[PDB]
Amino acid sequence: SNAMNFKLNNTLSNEINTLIIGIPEHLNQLERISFNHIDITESLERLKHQHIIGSKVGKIYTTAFDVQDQTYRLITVGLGNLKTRSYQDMLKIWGHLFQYIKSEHIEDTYLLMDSFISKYDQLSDVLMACGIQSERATYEFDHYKSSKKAPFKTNLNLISESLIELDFIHEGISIGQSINLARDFSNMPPNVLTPQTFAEDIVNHFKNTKVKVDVKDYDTLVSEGFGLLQAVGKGSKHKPRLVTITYNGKDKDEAPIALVGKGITYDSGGYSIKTKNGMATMKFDMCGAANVVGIIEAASRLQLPVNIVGVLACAENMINEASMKPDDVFTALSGETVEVMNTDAEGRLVLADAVFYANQYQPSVIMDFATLTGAAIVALGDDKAAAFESNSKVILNDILQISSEVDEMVFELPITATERASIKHSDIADLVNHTNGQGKALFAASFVTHFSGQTPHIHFDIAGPATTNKASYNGPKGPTGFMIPTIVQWLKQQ
Amino acid sequence: SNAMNFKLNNTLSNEINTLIIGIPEHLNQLERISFNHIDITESLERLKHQHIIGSKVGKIYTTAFDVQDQTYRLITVGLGNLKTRSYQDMLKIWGHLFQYIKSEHIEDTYLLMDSFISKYDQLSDVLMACGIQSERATYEFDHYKSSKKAPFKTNLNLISESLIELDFIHEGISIGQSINLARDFSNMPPNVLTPQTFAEDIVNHFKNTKVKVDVKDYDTLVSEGFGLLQAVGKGSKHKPRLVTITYNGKDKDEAPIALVGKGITYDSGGYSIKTKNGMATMKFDMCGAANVVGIIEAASRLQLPVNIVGVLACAENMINEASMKPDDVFTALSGETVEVMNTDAEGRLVLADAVFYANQYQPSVIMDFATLTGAAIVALGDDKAAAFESNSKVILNDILQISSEVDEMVFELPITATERASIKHSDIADLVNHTNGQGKALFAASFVTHFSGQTPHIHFDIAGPATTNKASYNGPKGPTGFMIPTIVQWLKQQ
Amino acid sequence: SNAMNFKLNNTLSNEINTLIIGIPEHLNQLERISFNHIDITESLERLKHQHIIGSKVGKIYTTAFDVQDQTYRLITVGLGNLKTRSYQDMLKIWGHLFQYIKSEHIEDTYLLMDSFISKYDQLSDVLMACGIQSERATYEFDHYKSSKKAPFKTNLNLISESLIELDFIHEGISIGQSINLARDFSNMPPNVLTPQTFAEDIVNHFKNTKVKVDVKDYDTLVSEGFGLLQAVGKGSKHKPRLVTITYNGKDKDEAPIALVGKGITYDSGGYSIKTKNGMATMKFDMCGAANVVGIIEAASRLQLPVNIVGVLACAENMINEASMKPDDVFTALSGETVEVMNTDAEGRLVLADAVFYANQYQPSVIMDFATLTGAAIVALGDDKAAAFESNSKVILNDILQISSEVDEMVFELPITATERASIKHSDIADLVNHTNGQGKALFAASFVTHFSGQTPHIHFDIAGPATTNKASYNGPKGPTGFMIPTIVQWLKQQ
Ligand SMILES: [Cl-]
Ligand SMILES: [Cl-]
Ligand SMILES: [Cl-]
Numbered sequence A, B, C: 001s002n003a004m005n006f007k008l009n010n011t012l013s014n015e016i017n018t019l020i021i022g023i024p025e026h027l028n029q030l031e032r033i034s035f036n037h038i039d040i041t042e043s044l045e046r047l048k049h050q051h052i053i054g055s056k057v058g059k060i061y062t063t064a065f066d067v068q069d070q071t072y073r074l075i076t077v078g079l080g081n082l083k084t085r086s087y088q089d090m091l092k093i094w095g096h097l098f099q100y101i102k103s104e105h106i107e108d109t110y111l112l113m114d115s116f117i118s119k120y121d122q123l124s125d126v127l128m129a130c131g132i133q134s135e136r137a138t139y140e141f142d143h144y145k146s147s148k149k150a151p152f153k154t155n156l157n158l159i160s161e162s163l164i165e166l167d168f169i170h171e172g173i174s175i176g177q178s179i180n181l182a183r184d185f186s187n188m189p190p191n192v193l194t195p196q197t198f199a200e201d202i203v204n205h206f207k208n209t210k211v212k213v214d215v216k217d218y219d220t221l222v223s224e225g226f227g228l229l230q231a232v233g234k235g236s237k238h239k240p241r242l243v244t245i246t247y248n249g250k251d252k253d254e255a256p257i258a259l260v261g262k263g264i265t266y267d268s269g270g271y272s273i274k275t276k277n278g279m280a281t282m283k284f285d286m287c288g289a290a291n292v293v294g295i296i297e298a299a300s301r302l303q304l305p306v307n308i309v310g311v312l313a314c315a316e317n318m319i320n321e322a323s324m325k326p327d328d329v330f331t332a333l334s335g336e337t338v339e340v341m342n343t344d345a346e347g348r349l350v351l352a353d354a355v356f357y358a359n360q361y362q363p364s365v366i367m368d369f370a371t372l373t374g375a376a377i378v379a380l381g382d383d384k385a386a387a388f389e390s391n392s393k394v395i396l397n398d399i400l401q402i403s404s405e406v407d408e409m410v411f412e413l414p415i416t417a418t419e420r421a422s423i424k425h426s427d428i429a430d431l432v433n434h435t436n437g438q439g440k441a442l443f444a445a446s447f448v449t450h451f452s453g454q455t456p457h458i459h460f461d462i463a464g465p466a467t468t469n470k471a472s473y474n475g476p477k478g479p480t481g482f483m484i485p486t487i488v489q490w491l492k493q494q
C-alpha cells in the first residue's frame, strides 16, 4: 500500500483546510496562481516581501492564509530560480515537502500542481520526482521498535487548470516502492535475514507475479560445483544459497540482460577478522543483491519490454572449526583453481561463481552490483560509486551519462594489463583473490570481470554510496537503494 | 577447615616455646605487658632501644627471648602510634603476622592479645580484623600445582588478663572464608569452571544449608524469554545458566534485597575479539557472581535477619558459526528490542535480563556487581570501584561511608539525561548496547539500571579492584573478593 | 557593542510590523495576552488548533497575523508546559529565538514579554536567560572570513503591562559578552595568539578599567624561578608569560579569591608528540586561561563586592633543539624537583608554578581551570566537567549545586592516598609528572593540588566541555565558555 493517495480534481469540500503551493524566486515566471476562482498571486507576493514565505530551494514555510471567508493552513516549499532548476532540486523540493507532510500528520490537503510546473521543464521530470519522493523520502524502518506509530494515508487533492495524466506519478511511486523494498532487505537484522530466509522472502514476494524465482539450496550448489560460494558460506550455521530471478518482458527468445548481486547477509571477515568498528553496519554487505531485486521489481511493475536474468550469490562469512582460511585452494564453477589469501575478500569470490553462472544464459551484457572494496571509498569518497568496464565501453558511457542526470554519482576506474596479470600471481593456483600491492579496487574488478570471458561486463563497486550516515531529502540514515534509479532509466531505453 | 585454631587462656604448656607480642611506638601507652605473671615491659623496652624489635606498622621482628629459665622464640609485629591506628593498619598488622606464621610453618604459639588492644580502639574492630586476616591473608590457590604442600593447623593460644568472648574472631573467620570461597570460583580455570559446573558447584555448596538454590538450564532460559542471556552464551559449547539463590533470614513475606552478579565464566569478546594481552586473566570476568555467592555465604553463616535473593547470569562469550554479531537484534526478557553493536559489551546484556528477573521478586533495593568497563578503570584507577545510583541516593551514601571505613575504595560516577537518552540511539531497535562516544562507563550503568524501572538500583563496576596484580597484607595476586566486606557490613545494619 | 538593543515600553511605531510571542502548552495558564489594545488570546488559540503555531519547547513558528487593519509578521517560540519549565528550557527558548531573529536579518520588532513570564517561574531567571542568550546564542567568529557580513543592530521593543526594571537583562548581556570574550581568545589562531600577544591583549582590554594587569616576561620568569613554566615554553620562538590580574571589588586588603588558568596557546605535545587527529583543535588548550579572563570581566562589569586575583600561565608547547624531553629534571617555583616523563603532560606543570605563585597572595580559596586530561573525557564523557577538591569539600558542594542549576554538568572525582603517594614515585626527583598506571585524571589533579599546601583548592578539568563539535541553542561549534556561568553565580553569593 501507498504512503500518499493521489487524487485529481474530484471535489472541493469544506472538510479540507490545508493548501500546498510551490514558490519560485520570481512569481511572474509562473502563470498567475489561482485557487478556487480567485487570483492569489499578489497576496503571495506580499507574504514573500514580508519574508513570511520564501523561494529558497526546498525550504518549508507555513502561514495562515485567507481566501474568501475561510482561513487555510498554507504550506510553502521554495523552488528557487526556475531557469536554473536541476533534477536534484526537484528531489530536494518534493523530498522536504513530503517529509514535512508526514511529520505533521496531515491527512487531507490541496496541492496546486501548476505552481510546480514551469515553462522550462518537461512535465514528466516534475511528476516523476513527485512520485519517487512520495515513497523514498518518507521511508522508515520501525518494525523492531516497540513505540512504532500507526501508518496513515495522506490524501493529496491535486488542483491543475490543464492536466489530465496522472501516470507519470504512479510510475514514480512504483520506482520509489522498489527502492524501499531493497532498503527493507538491507535494514533487516543479520540474525533474522539469513541466506535461506532471504531466498524464501524473494520467492514469496514474486509468488503471484510474472517474475519466476529459482532457489538453489546448499547440497545442490555444491554438487553442481559452486566451489567459491561453498567456500565463503560453509563457516556459518546458515548455509549459502543461489537465487535465480527471470523476467521475460518482451517474451522473445532474445538474449537477456544479466544482473548479478552480492548477497553476503553478514560479513565478519572470516579468519581475516574485521576490527570492532569494521564489523559495524555489515548487515549492509548484501545491498548489491537487494538492489538487483529492486531493479527487477521496478522493471516488472512498469512492464518494460526487456528480458532480465538476476543471479544472487547469498552467503554468511563466519568463523568456525571448518571455515575458509588464507592459503586455502578451491575450484571455482569455471573449473579454475583459486588461492584464498584474504577471507575478507569474500565478495569477489561469490561474484565469480555467480558471473560464470550468469554467462551460461548467454546475456547481451552482464552488470554486477556489490559493496566490495574499502579502496573504492578511499578513491572516490563515500558518496560516489566506482564503475569498471570490460568489453563494454559504449554501454558504460551511456550509464555514466544517465546517472549524472538522475542525481547518482558514478565514475569510471580502469582495468589495465597490470590487474589482468596480477590476479594470476599465485605460486600454487590459477588465480589469487588478493594483492598486497595498491590499486585494490582495480584488482577486485579484474578478478570479477575475468569470469565473464569476452561478454560485455560492467562492475559496480557501491561500497560507499550504498549506505549513508546522514539523513537527507532522499530519506533517513541507512541503505540508499543506490543504482536503482540509474539502471531502471537505462532499462527504459532498451 | 580453618587455617588457624583459636584457643582462649588454655593451659600454659611446656610443649610451646613461641611467643607473639604487638609492639607500639610508646610501650607506656599499653597496660604493662606480662607473660605468665612476669612483667616483661622493661625487657621489651631495651630490645626496642637496641633496634632488635620495633614499632613500624606491620613489620615483623623476631628474637631469642628469655623469660625465667626457658628460651622463647619471640615474634613481634609493629603497631605504630596507637592514637593514629586506622582499620587499614589493623589489616596490615594481622595480615603480615599470619602470613609470617604460615610461611614459617609454626604449629604452636602463644599470642598476647592484650598487647594488641588499646584504650583508643574498639575491641570488636581488632578481633574482627584478626578473624578476617587469619583466612584472607593466608589464602592460596595451589590445587593445580604438583608440588603443593600439605595443609596444617596452627594452634593459637591466646593469653588475655581480661577477655572472655571469642565470638568476634569467629565472626571474622566466617567472613574471611566467604571471601576465599569467592576467590576459589574466580581462580578456577575457564575450561574447568563452565556455566554448568559453576551452577552445579553452587547447588552442592548450599545443599545442606538454609540457602535454597534454583538452576535454570539452557532450554528453560530460551522458553522463558531470556533473550539477551541466550544471545551472549549461544556461541559456546557450554550453554548459559541462570542461578537463583534465596536466603530468608527473618521473614516469609518481607521484601528481599536483590543481589545481581555477572557470571561470565570466560570473555573472548565474541566477534568483537580482544587483543592478545586483552584475553589474559579473563577467567576473572565472573568475579561479580562469585562475590555475590560470598556475600550470601557470609550472611547465612552469620545468621543475619535479612531476606536476600541472588540472581546470577552465567555464560561463556565465545566465537562460532552462530554466535552473536554486531548488527544483531534480540528481544530482552523485558520485551524490549536490543541492537548489539559490540559483542565485547556482553556484561550489560546478561545483567539486563538478570536485573529484570530480580525485579519480579519486588525487592526493596537491587545491587548488581560486575567487571564491566575498561573506562571505569581509566576513570578511577585500578584500585577503586565505580558506583552508580538510580533512585537510591540515600542507600548509596551509606555504602560509600561504610566502604571507606572497611578499607575498600568505592566512588560515585553519575548517570545523567545524556546517558538515559543515548542508550536509545538505535536506528532499528528500542535500545543499543554500545556508544562510540566517550563516558562509556556511564553508558553501561545507564543500560543496566534501565531494567529495574523505578526500583532503587545501585550498580557496582568492579572491573579494576576485583583483581590485583600485586601481593599484599590482603593476600596473593588474583581475585580480591572486593565489595564483600562492604556489603556484609551494610547487611549487618538492616 | 551589543547584538540586541533593548527598549522597554517604547513609543508605538507605525513602521514596525513584526511581533514576537511565546506560546505555552495551555494558553489559559498565562494572563490574557493583549497587543495594542486588543485581546488576541482566542485568535492565537485557533492558530494553535490549526497547527499553524505550537508550544514545543524552543520551536519557531511564523505566520501572517492580522490585528486591526495592519498585517503583522508573527514570530512564535514554544514554551512547553509552564509548570515543568526548567532553566535549560529558558536557554533553549531564548537561544533559538535570537538565532532566528539574527539569521532573518530582523532590525525592528515588538516583543510581548508578558507571554514569557509565568506565575510558575522566577521573573529574574527569565530576564537573565534572555540577556545571556542575546549575546551567547548569536555569537560568531567570522573575523578571518573574506565574505563576512556587516554587523547590524536589532531593536527589540518590549511590551509589558506591568514591568519597569530592565536591569536583569543588562546583567545577562554583560555575562554573555564575557563568555564571548573568552570565546574570542579561544577561537584565535595559534600563529596569531601567542603567549606574548595574549598577555598584550589582556593589558589593552583592562587598560581603562578597575582591573589591574601585571605581565611577567621571559627573563623575569627564569630569574624569579618559574622553572616548570620555563621548561614547558622554552621550545617555542614565542616564549612563555605569566599574567597577574587583580580586581578589588570590596576591600583594600581582604583575602582574595585565586583563579588560576592554563594558558597553553598551542600544544603539540612536545617530544611526546601528538597524532595527526590529536593536534587538531589544540588552539583550545588555553580555554582555561580565557575563561578566567571572562569570569573577571563579568565580576568587574557587575561590580561585585569580591576580591579576585587571577594567575595565567601562558606558554607554547613546541619541539626544537633545546625543548623539554622525557627524563628531564627541573626545579619548580616551590623549590621541589620534578622529573618530566611525558611532555604532553605540560598543563599540570604550568599550573603547578601558577598555583604556588597564587598561594603567595594568601587566598581564601584557589580554583584552577584547565583542559588537562583525556582520561577525564573517558571518565565522564565529552559534555561534563571533572571537579576535584583538596581541603575544600564545602565550597565544592556549593559549586556542584550551583552548576546543576545553571545548565552546566560538573561532577566530582576523588583524590585518594594512592594519588598523593604516586606523584612522588620518581627514582631521581621529588615529584614525577606522569604515571603509566590508570586513573590519570586523578593523578593530574593530585599533582596540581599539591602546590597549594593546605589552602582550599578546587581543580576543574574541562578538557571535554570547554569545546563542542555541535551547534546548539548556546551558540556555534567551538569554545563554550564553560564554568563562567557557574563561577559568576558563585561569586554573586559571596
Ligand atoms: Cl523563477
Ligand atoms: Cl580442491
Ligand atoms: Cl571482495
Ligand SMILES: [Cl-]
Binding pocket: A360, A361
Ligand atoms: Cl542454463
Ligand SMILES: [Cl-]
Binding pocket: A334, A450, A451, A453
Ligand atoms: Cl574463463
Ligand SMILES: [Cl-]
Binding pocket: B055, B056, B057, B079, B080, B081
Ligand atoms: Cl609506623
Ligand SMILES: [Cl-]
Binding pocket: B024, B025, B026, B027, B029, B080, B081, B082, B083
Ligand atoms: Cl603508641
Ligand SMILES: [Cl-]
Binding pocket: B329, B330, B331
Ligand atoms: Cl527478535
Ligand SMILES: [Cl-]
Binding pocket: B344, B345, B346, B347, B348, B349, B372, B373, B444
Ligand atoms: Cl558490558
Ligand SMILES: [Cl-]
Binding pocket: B360, B361
Ligand atoms: Cl517470581
Ligand SMILES: [Cl-]
Binding pocket: B334, B450, B451, B452, B453
Ligand atoms: Cl522496563
Ligand SMILES: [Cl-]
Binding pocket: C024, C025, C026, C027, C029, C080, C081, C082, C083
Ligand atoms: Cl502552560
Ligand SMILES: [Cl-]
Binding pocket: C055, C056, C057, C079, C080, C081
Ligand atoms: Cl514540548
Ligand SMILES: [Cl-]
Binding pocket: C329, C330, C331
Ligand atoms: Cl635543576
Ligand SMILES: [Cl-]
Binding pocket: C344, C345, C346, C347, C348, C349, C372, C373, C444
Ligand atoms: Cl597535564
Ligand SMILES: [Cl-]
Binding pocket: C360, C361
Ligand atoms: Cl607577592
Ligand SMILES: [Cl-]
Binding pocket: C334, C450, C451, C453
Ligand atoms: Cl609545597
Ligand code: NA
Binding pocket: A390, A391, A449, A450, A451, A452, A453, A454, A455, A457
Ligand atoms: Na572479461
Ligand code: NA
Binding pocket: A382, A463, A464, A465, A466, A467, A468
Ligand atoms: Na557507506
